[PDB]
């Protein structure tokens, strides 16, 4: 069925073992609630206002959680490129950068492994790749590489090349940019190798502190051509 929603609701038997129940009162568990409407909604389910638990929580706290729910929406309509855009549209118009970025990531997720003649992933995500902030800037590109991974199109790859050449403070963003560029193409990639190694010398050579820096730019070099 479209709404099984049971394994979360299976957590009913364990409450009366060890004494009193309902001791779980944290907020991070609501993140798991995303997957409760997220993971089950794979294989072509639908949640018409059943993401309301995610909706008001997207209006409650956790900026990263708003991004999380809005990205989990793209798991919903995986491979439904023609119907999924109409369900995501309502979030592209959000007053929250986290929800809008998660809706851009959802548009990327829906196209992952499907080459549609209308290029709706490239055509919607392009305008956000160099965006002023980060929610729409950083997450503006991850779905596009997911949409255009196997369809290794170099034209939009060139469009995301100057993000390495942005030279802005992108300590988290340039790393995931190397993830997204390598997602399109890694290994024997002419522009992606050069852009990463030059940016590595430009910032990461003078500061090598945390694994955010040099665990994503090495992923952009040769993971696709590992065979």
């Amino acid at each position: 069925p479209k709404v099984p929603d049971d394994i979360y609701k299976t957590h009913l038997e364990n409450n009366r073992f060890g004494g009193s129940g309902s001791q779980v009162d944290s907020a991070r568990m609501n993140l798991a609630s995303s997957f409760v409407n997220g993971f089950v909604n794979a294989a072509f389910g639908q949640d018409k206002l059943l993401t309301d638990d995610g909706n008001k929580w997207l209006y409650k706290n956790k900026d990263h959680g708003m991004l999380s729910a809005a990205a989990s929406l793209g798991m919903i309509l995986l491979w439904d490129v023609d119907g999924g855009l109409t369900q995501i549209d309502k979030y592209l118009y959000s007053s929250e950068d986290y929800i809008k970025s998660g809706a851009l990531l959802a548009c990327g997720i829906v196209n992952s492994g499907v080459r549609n003649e209308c290029d709706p992933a490239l055509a919607l995500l392009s305008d956000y790749v160099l965006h002023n902030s980060n929610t729409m800037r950083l997450g503006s590109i991850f779905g596009l590489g997911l949409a255009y991974a196997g369809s290794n199109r170099e034209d939009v790859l060139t469009l995301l090349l100057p993000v390495m050449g942005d030279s802005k403070s992108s300590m988290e963003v340039a790393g995931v940019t190397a993830l997204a560029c390598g997602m399109i193409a890694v290994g024997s990639c002419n522009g992606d190798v050069t852009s990463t190694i030059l940016q590595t010398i430009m910032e990461k050579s003078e500061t090598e502190l945390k694994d955010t820096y040099a665990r994503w730019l090495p992923l952009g070099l040769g993971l696709n051509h590992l065979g």
Binding site: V81, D82, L85, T86, D89, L92, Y93, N116, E117, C118, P120, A123, L124, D127
Partner: protein, 37 residues
Amino acid sequence: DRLRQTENRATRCKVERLQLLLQQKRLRRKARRDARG
């Protein structure tokens, strides 16, 4: 707030155009199958 209103209006007209093109392509695909069967 004005920049975001111009941005969301540009996005809208891009999405409304993409939905029309996807629907037109989907109808052409279907018309080929329904003519083969």
